[PDB]
Amino acid sequence: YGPDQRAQKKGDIILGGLFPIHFGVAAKDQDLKSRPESVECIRYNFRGFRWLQAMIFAIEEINSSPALLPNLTLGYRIFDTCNTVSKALEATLSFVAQNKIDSLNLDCSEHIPSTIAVVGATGSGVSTAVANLLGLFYIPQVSYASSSRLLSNKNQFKSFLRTIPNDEHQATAMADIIEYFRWNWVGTIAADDDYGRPGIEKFREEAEERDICIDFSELISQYSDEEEIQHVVEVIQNSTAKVIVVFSSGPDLEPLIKEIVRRNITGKIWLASEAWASSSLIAMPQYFHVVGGTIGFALKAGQIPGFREFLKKVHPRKSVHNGFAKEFWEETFNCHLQEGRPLCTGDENISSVETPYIDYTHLRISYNVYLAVYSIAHALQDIYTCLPGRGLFTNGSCADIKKVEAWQVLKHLRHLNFTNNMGEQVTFDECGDLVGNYSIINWHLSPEDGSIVFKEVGYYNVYAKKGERLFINEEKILWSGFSREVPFSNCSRDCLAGTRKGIIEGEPTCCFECVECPDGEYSDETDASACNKCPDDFWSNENHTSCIAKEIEFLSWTEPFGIALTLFAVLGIFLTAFVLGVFIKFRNTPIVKATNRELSYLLLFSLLCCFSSSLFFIGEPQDWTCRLRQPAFGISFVLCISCILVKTNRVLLVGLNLQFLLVFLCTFMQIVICVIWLYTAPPSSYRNQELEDEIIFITCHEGSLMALGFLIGYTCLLAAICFFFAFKSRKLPENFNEAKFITFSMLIFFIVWISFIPAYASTYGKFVSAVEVIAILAASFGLLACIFFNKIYIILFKPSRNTIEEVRCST
Amino acid sequence: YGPDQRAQKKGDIILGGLFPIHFGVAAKDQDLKSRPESVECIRYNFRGFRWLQAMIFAIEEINSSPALLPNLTLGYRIFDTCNTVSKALEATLSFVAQNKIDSLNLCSEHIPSTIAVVGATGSGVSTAVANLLGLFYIPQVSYASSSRLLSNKNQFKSFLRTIPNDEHQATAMADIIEYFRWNWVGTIAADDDYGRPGIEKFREEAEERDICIDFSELISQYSDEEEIQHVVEVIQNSTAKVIVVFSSGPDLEPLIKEIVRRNITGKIWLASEAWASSSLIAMPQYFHVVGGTIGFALKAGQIPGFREFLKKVHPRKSVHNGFAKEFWEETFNCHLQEFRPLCTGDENISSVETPYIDYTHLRISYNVYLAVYSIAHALQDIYTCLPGRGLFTNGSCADIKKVEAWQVLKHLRHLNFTNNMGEQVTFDECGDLVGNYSIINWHLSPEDGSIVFKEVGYYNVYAKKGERLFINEEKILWSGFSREVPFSNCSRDCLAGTRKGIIEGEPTCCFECVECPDGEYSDETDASACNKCPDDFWSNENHTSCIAKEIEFLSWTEPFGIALTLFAVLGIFLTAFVLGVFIKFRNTPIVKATNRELSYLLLFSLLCCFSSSLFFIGEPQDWTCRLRQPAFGISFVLCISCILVKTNRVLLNLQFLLVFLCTFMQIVICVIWLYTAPPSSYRNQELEDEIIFITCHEGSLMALGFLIGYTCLLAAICFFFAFKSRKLPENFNEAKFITFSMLIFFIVWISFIPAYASTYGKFVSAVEVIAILAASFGLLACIFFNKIYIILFKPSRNTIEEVRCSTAAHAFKVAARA
Ligand SMILES: *[C@@H]1O[C@H](CO)[C@@H](O[C@@H]2O[C@H](CO)[C@@H](O)[C@H](O)[C@H]2NC(C)=O)[C@H](O)[C@H]1NC(C)=O
Ligand SMILES: *[C@@H]1O[C@H](CO)[C@@H](O[C@@H]2O[C@H](CO)[C@@H](O)[C@H](O)[C@H]2NC(C)=O)[C@H](O)[C@H]1NC(C)=O
Ligand SMILES: *[C@@H]1O[C@H](CO)[C@@H](O[C@@H]2O[C@H](CO)[C@@H](O)[C@H](O)[C@H]2NC(C)=O)[C@H](O)[C@H]1NC(C)=O
Ligand SMILES: C[C@@H](NCCCc1cccc(C(F)(F)F)c1)c1cccc2ccccc12
């Protein structure tokens, strides 16, 4: 036979089942000093007993109806695995015992029944160990809870089927949930078995595609010792990540949760996989301050109508075929059953004690057990109603229901398609898998009772296009059980505008510093990895949020220095017009006729042009003022020097009038120099940007310096010749000491235009035009004063008629 | 009973063996009235047959020996697994058939008992065998399974191995990668219990050492076309040149064939131990892809009679080996009687080159040898146990006539023996050994063209962390032909004037280089932050190091300051000479006529005016700049007052009062200016970045205004009262010269107005100095240079009447009108 505690019943066709009635086995490390005994199972599991009852209720309901398998009863043989590979293998060796006597040729009870199909285990490692042995004899195994991706491999597992989705959609959904709430800094914890490792590897692969940085990654187990648990707890406690993604079940997560609760570590955001998101080992009222507000996945519910009334009929004396009912009665009512702790009577009421057996709201894994039994029954009904010539075997032949074999049932299970009680269609794919939606739940705290309440906050729709599968209603979520604000789980705070992301070495790419943008660059947005250089005509604001236009610099009108220069120029023009009016008003008087009368008019006109030529420097330096600011002053002032130079004594030793030829031939050189310079290479405007970054100047580009050198040197040469021929005869008393005044005027010229040299070599912006204008007006006021003011003071001032006569002029 | 072909011999105690005599099975499916028949194994493995011969040789050598297990013979039942789980479980069901009948109470009545099994090769196979053998506590010693998941003794109760596990090898891969300074790799692992935990341990160790991983893929022996195309696309879309592979030969052969048929060259392959010596991959047709591979190997051992036993195999004389017949058929390509030609029993096995006798080193064969001798020494410990000293309950001993499998497992846990090379064998608490690694490189034989595995280093697991690796870099050919180490970084290194910059969406190993701005620098290679060096320093034009900003001031050892100091010294040693020749000629006539005591005070004030020029040279400090300008102000107002007062005044000594008042009225100003807003030194850094200007901040400007203004006023009035007497001939026409001097003053302090406003804050001090040393000379000359001549070049002209009316003007003799 096999294990002695079982639920079995005879029939024409026998099914097999494997359920965890205990949570684990007793902790005993054997030292092998004596022959090893059988291990004992410890903690009773009411949920697994309900799953076993779901299988038995399905079998009895199928045998009741006359439409699903007429005149042919099903039987069963069900064992207990205790979530352990070894006990499951001791059961599976009894399943395959008749097949294996044939294959190993041992020929001896000869009344051993044969098992057609087995309802599978809950854990993936247990399912792999059972599947390796059931695939040898082609016995089909349908699992209700194993969801590892490794069991989709049909090269290794030839006869495995399941009614639960595999876990790739769940890890993708976890990555989508993390992307929805805009986190990037997470930690991961998985169980060290075939369920946790592929799930957490698939989560890691999906997480690096979405730029989510994982801080830590640790493995746990039910049989971890103490120092591994303090290593994992110290890894959790050292990290700044708040969101932790866990692939585990209840038994593998319980020691870690107990040690975290003992140290009272709060503030973490847990992401549960489906195995522990509804686990009564973890959803405890005294753990809540650690595990409140846990967000998890759940399967879709289903309706089994007469099931609760079947569940309330269990009894130790009336369940002859069920052998697990006795310990159920003992563990519910805390008594001892004395077959024929206080002593039981067998009369107690199941509703009086609250256990997970009938305290439930939805049926989720129990529905998978129900559907597995109906899948096997509709495969056998497909065999029963097969028509000759239309079968699934050679030449369209049909199997015999009276001598059916397991490989033919597996063949009909691969081509299976049927409608359940809820109206949906059930079909397995080529990998032997089934697909379904997910519900998304949150852990709350009951106000009526003080216990944990699972509230649905969203769904995950697996038939939708990628990136459109998640729905979450955020207004129904209490973070950490009580808070209404979404928590912060990034590595570092976001950089603002005006700054830039900087690397921290040895750390992942989600962790950065915020460095301010440099002097000439902005940053427009938040979380900028670079600073953008501002355009040529604009310079960055001090805030560095955005940049504004530069400041243009030029000496201008409507400026409190240019107004002063303009008023001085107008005063000079008014003075020259006054002197011209005085000379015209008395032109038959001897003082003006003793001087050359026809020649002073050109002198006064040249002084008028010299005053008016200084206005070209003031203002915005356009193109046609840079071309005429120097030649106008050059020509006008050389005309002035020539008109001075003719009227000196002893400089006319050698046409109709013979004094204007000297003036014409001395002005003609400046005229031709200006014409050839302005023809070969004219000056231009120039926007100067290389002196200061913040401001730009508007200046005049000269074009050449050879022609400007000639145009200054010729004027200095004429000034030197006139100064020589005036200083040589300075003692002559004629014309009211005129040669002395010519000497003083040329001296003032040379002092001003030597003393204004070092302004040019040092100043660079507005001040150059200022010192040019001040120099021009200073030189021309000096020349006008020194030539004419003594003559004016004699003509009309208080010595009016006394010193005006011709006999006084040369005395 | 069980599988049909087997190697089988009987004795007192029966062992068991699982070896991969084939490489795999053939493919089929589709139960369309196939009552499913047994599947066929396809490709013959000569290395696995050598491994099977090692076990038989060890058993026969023990049975010949009188020192180990006397009067007790060992036996064997050995099966073929074909590297698949299902054949191994078919054989293991035959191992445990007797213990099974005791359990389920379910016969042949002649089933022998197996007490130990020499284990499987693949970790996926050994896991499935160990799950069923641990039910009955039958020990299982494996020779090649190296997955870390088999170290878990809560699940695998009776598992031991004579090979080390793969934690050290996965750490050693990251050590080798960190040795050659690469940080940008890709990983490939098989999809089973050997590849996935090894590559996960490597990923953890690589992320600990700041090594970035670009891709990570999984392959299998049963991958279809599209998965291989996807992996090849992933490989040749990447710039990483180093690929780390955890796989065996059969799981890697399809991928290698697809890479070979495309010319994908230049990759650097890092081999794990299972495929670094595989004959399926190390072939001459693949050398342009897999040449230059660097891989791991175990330590070799000696079996001193194994080759002559290997050359003794015959199909008709090996009556206890059922696998010899297919060996003979597959070697000489013939058919044995009981189209390919007929065999004779007369061939020499030294002709055909197969992996059977063509090896250099025994590595896994030595592990099979040790796995047999471990079981033999545990049974020897059972046989030589003294009562009172046993490992069981009351110090009792096991019975050798009626031994049980759990008792052999108990002695296997407490084993410590010494092997044939004088080293100690013992298992730890997880049932493991530890051992060194050899590091090999793939080369090309110049004599034949086959692939040679050349040792280039070792990995020592008994050393401490960080000192376990020795690599001789001179012996490596890098793709089989190259002598330079490849480049396998994501991006190039940044230079001395640059820092790193983030590429958004890419890992930390992929960056940009951005130059440091003005004022910062960098000096190392990978900077990631520019540095601002401290105050009064500015960066170079290279942004490598920063140099010191130079300070700018009128210095003493600068030659311009030397020239100005020599003009000052000439001025003082001119006025001192004037003072000396005045003191010698006091009572002479043309000296007593100018109020001789005012001349001495005038020269004292003028010497102070010369000496006030030296306060403007040097680095400006607090005590110097506060006394720069008031010294010149007081000295010059004393000069102007002494020049002004010596013209004759009838009413309003009782004359010096004036010379008091006219200076006192400025002294007070100076006082107030130093007691409400004194000037100070000031470093002005904002004009030029690379130049530090040191100058003065002059406090309140208004005060200075006042100062200057007063001076000027008291000059002007003097000028006027000199000019009014300009045509009055007395004192060699003194008045005129006074006027001239005053004019000079004015001109010198007017024409220096633009330059003072031009270089202000940069080089104004020099300007000032020049102005002073022009004005002072003016005074001196124009006042007291005319008389000197008549003092000491024309004697007997210094008479009284000349002071009244002078015949010869001279005026220096006009310098003799040179
Ligand atoms: C935490 O980090 C994430 C990712 O780094 C930030 O989310 C990004 O925000 C910007 C601006 O709104 C979007 O353009 C990106 O698409 C977001 N990323 C994702 C993946 O959605 C998030 O803003 C950060 N949270 C806080 C509080 O700073
Ligand atoms: C593992 O490898 C190390 C490194 O070669 C071995 O240590 C050396 O052994 C040789 C030969 O006995 C000595 O000459 C050296 O001095 C040893 N040390 C070093 C640092 O090279 C070690 O013996 C090997 N272990 C085993 C068990 O073989
Ligand atoms: C590839 O990258 C690595 C690490 O980013 C560089 O290794 C550094 O090399 C320098 C000099 O060779 C050492 O000073 C550093 O200590 C190394 N860093 C580490 C972490 O080991 C390597 O130089 C790069 N290779 C090339 C060619 O640029
Ligand atoms: C208005 C005045 N401009 C002098 C520019 C000097 C300069 C500035 C920059 C570069 C150069 C250089 F190219 F010559 F070096 C020279 C000017 C104009 C015309 C005649 C003049 C005759 C006598 C005195 C002044 C004259």
Ligand SMILES: C[C@@H](NCCCc1cccc(C(F)(F)F)c1)c1cccc2ccccc12
């Ligand atoms: C040494 C000198 N320091 C300030 C010169 C300013 C200035 C620069 C250029 C021109 C002028 C002036 F024309 F206005 F004088 C003044 C100084 C100190 C104290 C008294 C002074 C009296 C007269 C002159 C200089 C005086």
Ligand SMILES: N[C@@H](Cc1c[nH]c2ccccc12)C(=O)O
């Ligand atoms: N999916 C889990 C089994 C499982 C699902 N739901 C559960 C609820 C309780 C316990 C286990 C489970 C596995 O693969 O092993």
Ligand SMILES: N[C@@H](Cc1c[nH]c2ccccc12)C(=O)O
């Ligand atoms: N270590 C491999 C087995 C192995 C080691 N060396 C080998 C050489 C050839 C083939 C297989 C192997 C495993 O765990 O599966």
Ligand SMILES: *[C@@H]1O[C@H](CO)[C@@H](O)[C@H](O)[C@H]1NC(C)=O
């Ligand atoms: C965690 O932090 C503690 C204290 O800073 C430190 O000693 C320890 O090394 C860190 N890491 C782990 C794994 O405990």
Ligand SMILES: *[C@@H]1O[C@H](CO)[C@@H](O)[C@H](O)[C@H]1NC(C)=O
């Ligand atoms: C645990 O933490 C909570 C905070 O939520 C605190 O109120 C309580 O006192 C703590 N208990 C212990 C035992 O530290």
Ligand SMILES: *[C@@H]1O[C@H](CO)[C@@H](O)[C@H](O)[C@H]1NC(C)=O
């Ligand atoms: C299953 O049967 C229904 C009934 O019409 C059909 O619509 C559906 O396509 C079938 N499914 C498969 C996979 O054949």
Ligand SMILES: *[C@@H]1O[C@H](CO)[C@@H](O)[C@H](O)[C@H]1NC(C)=O
């Ligand atoms: C999955 O969910 C969507 C909407 O949430 C629903 O329309 C669909 O029918 C669900 N799938 C199944 C199989 O019920």
Ligand SMILES: *[C@@H]1O[C@H](CO)[C@@H](O)[C@H](O)[C@H]1NC(C)=O
């Ligand atoms: C820019 O700086 C000013 C300070 O004057 C501040 O008022 C303003 O808010 C800043 N602009 C921003 C932050 O956009």
Ligand SMILES: *[C@@H]1O[C@H](CO)[C@@H](O)[C@H](O)[C@H]1NC(C)=O
């Ligand atoms: C590889 O690169 C090509 C071209 O760059 C691209 O079209 C293709 O999608 C890539 N494939 C993968 C698997 O990345």
Ligand SMILES: *[C@@H]1O[C@H](CO)[C@@H](O)[C@H](O)[C@H]1NC(C)=O
């Ligand atoms: C593959 O590349 C090599 C160069 O390394 C070349 O010699 C060879 O011809 C290529 N293979 C084929 C089939 O062309």
Ligand SMILES: *[C@@H]1O[C@H](CO)[C@@H](O)[C@H](O)[C@H]1NC(C)=O
């Ligand atoms: C094994 O035995 C030798 C002596 O026989 C001893 O030196 C050595 O320490 C032993 N090893 C262990 C692990 O006990």
Ligand SMILES: *[C@@H]1O[C@H](CO)[C@@H](O)[C@H](O)[C@H]1NC(C)=O
């Ligand atoms: C440093 O600058 C000098 C000249 O300024 C140049 O010659 C030299 O090459 C630079 N050094 C570098 C670029 O490493």
Ligand SMILES: [Ca+2]
């Ligand atoms: Ca029925």
Ligand SMILES: [Ca+2]
């Ligand atoms: Ca790091």
Ligand SMILES: [Ca+2]
């Ligand atoms: Ca012997």
Ligand SMILES: [Ca+2]
């Ligand atoms: Ca990316």
